[PDB]
């Protein structure tokens, strides 16, 4: 059990034990993803306003924050140190550092801390050996607990329901922009839907050939293969689903390309188990697309991890030799992209639980005609 | 005339001349608002991926960017220096710095540059005297050119049209969350609407008493005073409109509170002229609310500047003695907030052009009953 929405204390300790083993005495966390990880909330718009968390080697956190964020920290299990605009926060921060960290020791610094804040606090930081937090904390975040996995599943359920309601309306004659905005709306009208993971991507026709396409003014017409890729956040955790359809009966190569991606995706997912290397899962979807002769058109990773961010560890990519372990959560999203013609991607979110890969997203993966 | 969508070259030069006078030899710009200012675009998701702009004292910009951002820089009038994942960008960055800046000279650093990038480049930065860019560049951004003022007006027009279509539907029985999401949608279905400035705020009933309220699950009912506050971006530039209504005939103190805010807002706007201090404009709306006895309930600045960000210079606040000048763009948004009862705010966007204050937003400012 734990008093927090999730178990933040168990993360703080795991983090402390972890950074302590690698030879660090403490960590400084700025608002962002790791702030969310350790506390469950994240403060917004702290431009050049000092909002920092000090994590000592033993004990709990201290927040030094602007007086204006008082209600956000009311129930914080730790030291809150408020500063008014008539005060110099960096004086307060120095005292805290000098009174906490020996001097000349190794500290971790949040990669997302603004340089602007770094500079004012140069007098303090000059005294220590500073290292990025990401190589340390990411080891923790890539292994999700049962509550996190439940947030992920919950975020995938919202996104599945959005798929079945969205394909029930008319898409013909409306634009990528308008459709993407219908999706956004629809996500935010599902119970439990925090917000979007990222702004919805709609790629129609030849536009679908570019993986990083941003939705344009192009109208959707009979003949288009139309890729939808969207996500939701649930308690801060992200889903990411891509499905691909057709307006009017599919023209023949469309059916073949699709079927190939369909087979590659579902077999890649089947490979997923504890103990197997990331690349071998990539090799599965890759081999299958290459075997049919399209290897030169599958132009990206099979997948990427999901979490508090949309892109995190682990990466299901050609090179990677990281063995997959229980708790890892990631996407399996192979695709085939034909310049000037069309594209097909199929994306599910997957979780490694009790040694085998579970599909968190489950929306119909067979080719629907519209 | 100018080749860019706006005049970026004239900003680079104004910036170079400005930072040069204050004794700096160059500036380093990370993706964000100032990047947009100087170039017209902004790259997204450059987590710990080095994407930096070097502005020397004379000449034009250099972009050092990830190979993956190639299309974004295709038409860049300057040096583009691409780096692959099989390359070390900080080696490339050192050479560029060593070959550009004398050493031991004063450089400007973007306040939004991540610390993570700062650290890898410590070998380089250790050699120079580093200062935040904001005190220098903000002097430029607070004075808008005619193209910028036109983006602002265009962003205010979209938001006015959203007001008249939104009050034509039923609000009763629907929640702050759902309404805020109807607004978001509606903004994005107007021609020219980039995106939102910020996510729409809907505050019904006693909820309206808190200025920084975030929309909740509370249903809107006959009897509520309902504040809507939303914005749009046009070519990257932001609007911000607040209007306030009532469901069913207003209950009497509601009419009085409103009328008072209505009078304060429009008179504050009338004060706006070149040559007058920011605080005196604040004193105008403040005095008027105090005169009727509500001074202790008007709990924030009259306004704040608008631009590429939603909050920038100038600030229409009690203390500020900055004289207002042509080109400044800002909000005039006084309010009265009654704990547990209700709130009323009226927000317009204003531009100082040819010595007098122009209202960019114009949606009906009188109390509508629903």
DSSP per residue, A160-187: HHHHHHHTTS--TT-BHHHHHHHHHHHH
Evaluate whether B179 touches B215 at the Cβ level (below 8 Å).
yes
Strand partners, A225: A246
CA B333 – CA B268 distance, rounded (Å): 9
Fold of B1-141: Creatine Amidinohydrolase; Chain A, domain 1 (3.40.350)
Residues of chain A positioned with their CB less than 8 A from the CB of B115: 30, 109-115, 117-118
CA B329 – CA B351 distance, rounded (Å): 4
CA B233 – CA B36 distance, rounded (Å): 13
CA B96 – CA B107 distance, rounded (Å): 14
Domain boundaries, chain A: 1-141, 142-370
Total residue length of chain B = 370
Evaluate whether A360 touches A240 at the Cβ level (below 8 Å).
no
Evaluate whether A269 touches A348 at the Cβ level (below 8 Å).
yes
CA B329 – CA A308 distance, rounded (Å): 36
Instruction: Using CB atoms, pick whichever of A48, A109, A181 lies closest to residue B111.
Output: A48
> Residue B206 has what DSSP assignment?
G
Binding positions of B for Zn(2+): 229, 240, 333, 347
Q: Test B113 with A114 for CB contact under 8 angstroms.
A: yes
**By C-alpha distance, which of A235, A266, A257 is closest to A338?**
A257
Element (H, E) at A201: strand A201-204
Residue A274 has which token pair?
Answer: 């504890």
CA A131 – CA A106 distance, rounded (Å): 7
> Residue A124 to residues A60, A299, B178: CA-CA distances in angstroms?
21, 46, 47
Binding positions of A: 229, 240, 333, 347
CA A280 – CA A294 distance, rounded (Å): 18
Strand partners, A28: A54, A109
The strand pair at A356-359 and A348-353 is best described as antiparallel
Strand order in the sheet with A329-332: A312-316, A303-305, A329-332, A348-353, A356-359
CA B176 – CA B180 distance, rounded (Å): 6
Strands annotated E in chain A = 26-29, 52-56, 62-66, 79-83, 106-109, 129-132, 195-196, 201-204, 225-230, 232-234, 237-238, 241-246, 303-305, 312-316, 329-332, 335-338, 342-345, 348-353, 356-359
Counting one residue from chain A and one from chain B, the pairs whose CB atoms sit within 8 A come to 73
CA B35 – CA B23 distance, rounded (Å): 22
Residue B328 has which token pair?
Answer: 């400044």
CA B98 – CA B94 distance, rounded (Å): 6
CA A278 – CA A298 distance, rounded (Å): 17
Binding positions of B: 229, 240, 333, 347
CA B60 – CA B144 distance, rounded (Å): 21
Evaluate whether B235 touches B149 at the Cβ level (below 8 Å).
no
- The residue in chain A having the minimum alpha-carbon distance to the alpha carbon of residue B46 is A112
Q: Test B115 with A115 for CB contact under 8 angstroms.
A: yes
* Residues with Cβ within 8 Å of residue B7, at least 6 apart in sequence: B145, B147
- The residue in chain B having the minimum alpha-carbon distance to the alpha carbon of residue A216 is B194
What are the phi and psi torsion angles at B163 (to 5°)?
Answer: -60, -45
Instruction: Using CB atoms, pick whichever of B114, B184, B189 lies closest to residue A111.
Output: B114
* Residues with Cβ within 8 Å of residue B92, at least 6 apart in sequence: B64, B81, B83
CA B347 – CA A284 distance, rounded (Å): 57
CA B217 – CA B261 distance, rounded (Å): 27
**Cβ count within 10 A of residue A172:** 13
Element (H, E) at B265: helix B253-271
Interior/surface letters B106-130, b for 16+ CB within 10 angstroms, e for the rest: ebbbbbbbbbbbbbbbeebbebbeb
> Residue A226 to residues A159, A222, A295, B76: CA-CA distances in angstroms?
17, 10, 22, 32
Packing angle of the helix pair B278-291, B253-271 (nearest 10 deg): 160
* Widest distance between CA atoms in chain B: 71
Cα-Cα-Cα-Cα dihedral of A360, A362, A365, A368, to 10°?
Answer: -140
Residues of chain B positioned with their CB less than 8 A from the CB of A113: 114-116
Instruction: Using CB atoms, pick whichever of A119, A181, A189 lies closest to residue B132.
Output: A119
CA B249 – CA B234 distance, rounded (Å): 36
Q: Test A115 with B134 for CB contact under 8 angstroms.
A: no
Backbone region of residue A135 per phi and psi (left: phi > 0; alpha: psi in -120 to 50; beta: other values): alpha
Mutation choice for A interface testing from B44, B46, B115 by most A CBs within 10 A: B115
> Residue B296 has what DSSP assignment?
T
CA B345 – CA B329 distance, rounded (Å): 19
DSSP per residue, A274-295: TT-BHHHHHHHHHHHHHHTT-T
* Residue with tokens 């599965």, as numbered in its chain: A284
How far is residue A43 CA from its own chain's centroid?
Answer: 18
> Residue A83 has what DSSP assignment?
E
**Cβ count within 10 A of residue B145:** 15
Residues of chain A positioned with their CB less than 8 A from the CB of B114: 111-115
Cis peptide before A314 (omega within 30 of 0): yes
Q: Test B47 with A178 for CB contact under 8 angstroms.
A: no
Evaluate whether A119 touches B130 at the Cβ level (below 8 Å).
yes
Binding positions of A for Zn(2+): 229, 240, 333, 347
Instruction: Using CB atoms, pick whichever of B114, B119, B181 lies closest to residue A130.
Output: B119
Cis peptide before A365 (omega within 30 of 0): no
Strand partners, B349: B331
Q: Is domain B142-370 annotated with CATH 2.30.110.10?
A: no
Q: How far is A367 from chain B (nearest CA, A)?
A: 29
CA A47 – CA B309 distance, rounded (Å): 11
Residue B235 has which token pair?
Answer: 């070519």
CA A181 – CA A202 distance, rounded (Å): 10
A193 burial (CB, 10 Å; 0-12 / 13-18 / 19+) is buried
* Residues with Cβ within 8 Å of residue A275, at least 6 apart in sequence: A323, A324, A355
Residue A279 has which token pair?
Answer: 């690349």
* CA dihedral for B205, B206, B209, B211, sign (positive or negative): negative
Q: How far is B270 from chain A (nearest CA, A)?
A: 30
Evaluate whether A53 touches A29 at the Cβ level (below 8 Å).
yes
> First-to-last CA distance in chain B?
49
> Residue A7 to residues A26, A280, A351, B235: CA-CA distances in angstroms?
20, 33, 20, 43
CA A218 – CA A199 distance, rounded (Å): 17
CA B153 – CA B234 distance, rounded (Å): 9
How far is residue B121 CA from its own chain's centroid?
Answer: 30
Resolution of the solved structure (Å): 2.6
CA A349 – CA B368 distance, rounded (Å): 47
CA A73 – CA A80 distance, rounded (Å): 7
Q: How far is B12 from chain A (nearest CA, A)?
A: 21
* Residue with tokens 């994590």, as numbered in its chain: A55
Q: How far is A356 from chain B (nearest CA, A)?
A: 31
CA B11 – CA B148 distance, rounded (Å): 12
What are the phi and psi torsion angles at A306 (to 5°)?
Answer: -125, 160
CA A87 – CA A82 distance, rounded (Å): 10
CA A41 – CA A53 distance, rounded (Å): 13
- The residue in chain A having the minimum alpha-carbon distance to the alpha carbon of residue B28 is A115
- H-helix segments, A88-145: 89-100, 115-120, 122-125, 134-141
Experimental method: X-ray
> Residue A97 to residues A12, A25, A62, A121, A126: CA-CA distances in angstroms?
19, 12, 11, 11, 12
Q: Test B116 with A132 for CB contact under 8 angstroms.
A: yes
CA A35 – CA A43 distance, rounded (Å): 9
Mutation choice for B interface testing from A69, A115, A117 by most B CBs within 10 A: A115
> Residue A96 has what DSSP assignment?
H
């Amino acid at each position: 059990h734990h008093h927090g929405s999730m178990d933040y204390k168990r993360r703080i300790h795991k983090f402390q034990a972890h950074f302590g083993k690698k030879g660090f005495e403490g960590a400084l966390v700025a608002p962002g993803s790791n702030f969310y990880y350790l506390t469950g909330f994240n403060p917004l718009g702290t431009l050049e306003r000092l909002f920092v968390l000090i994590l000592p080697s033993e004990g709990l956190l201290t927040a030094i924050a602007p007086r204006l964020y008082e209600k956000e920290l009311e129930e914080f299990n730790g030291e809150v140190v408020l500063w008014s605009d008539s005060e110099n926060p960096y004086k307060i921060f120095a005292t805290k550092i000098k009174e906490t960290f020996k001097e000349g020791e190794k500290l971790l610094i949040d990669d997302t801390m603004p340089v602007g804040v770094f500079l004012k606090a140069k007098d303090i930081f000059d005294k220590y050996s500073l290292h990025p937090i990401s190589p340390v904390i990411s080891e923790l975040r890539e292994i999700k607990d049962k509550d996190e996995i439940k947030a992920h599943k919950k975020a995938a359920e919202i996104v599945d329901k959005v798929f079945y309601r969205f394909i029930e309306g008319k898409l013909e004659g409306k634009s990528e922009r308008e459709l993407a905005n219908r999706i956004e709306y629809m996500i935010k009208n599902e119970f439990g839907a925090d917000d979007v993971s990222f702004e919805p991507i709609v790629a129609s026709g030849p536009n679908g050939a570019n993986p990083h396409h941003r939705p344009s003014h192009r109208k959707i017409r009979k003949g288009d293969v139309v890729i939808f890729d969207y996500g939701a956040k649930y308690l801060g955790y992200c889903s990411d689903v891509t499905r691909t359809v057709v307006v009017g009966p599919p023209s023949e190569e469309v059916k073949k390309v699709y079927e190939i991606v369909k087979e590659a995706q579902e077999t890649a997912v089947q490979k997923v188990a504890e103990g197997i290397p990331a690349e071998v899962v990539d090799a599965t979807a890759r081999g299958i697309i290459s075997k049919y002769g399209y290897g030169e058109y599958f132009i990206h990773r099979t997948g990427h991890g999901l979490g508090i961010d949309v892109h995190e560890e682990p990466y299901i990519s050609p090179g990677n030799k990281k063995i997959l372990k229980d708790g890892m959560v990631f996407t399996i999203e192979p695709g085939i992209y034909l310049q000037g013609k069309f594209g097909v991607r199929i994306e599910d979110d997957v979780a490694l639980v009790d040694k085998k890969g579970i599909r968190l997203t489950n929306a119909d993966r067979e080719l629907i005609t519209l």
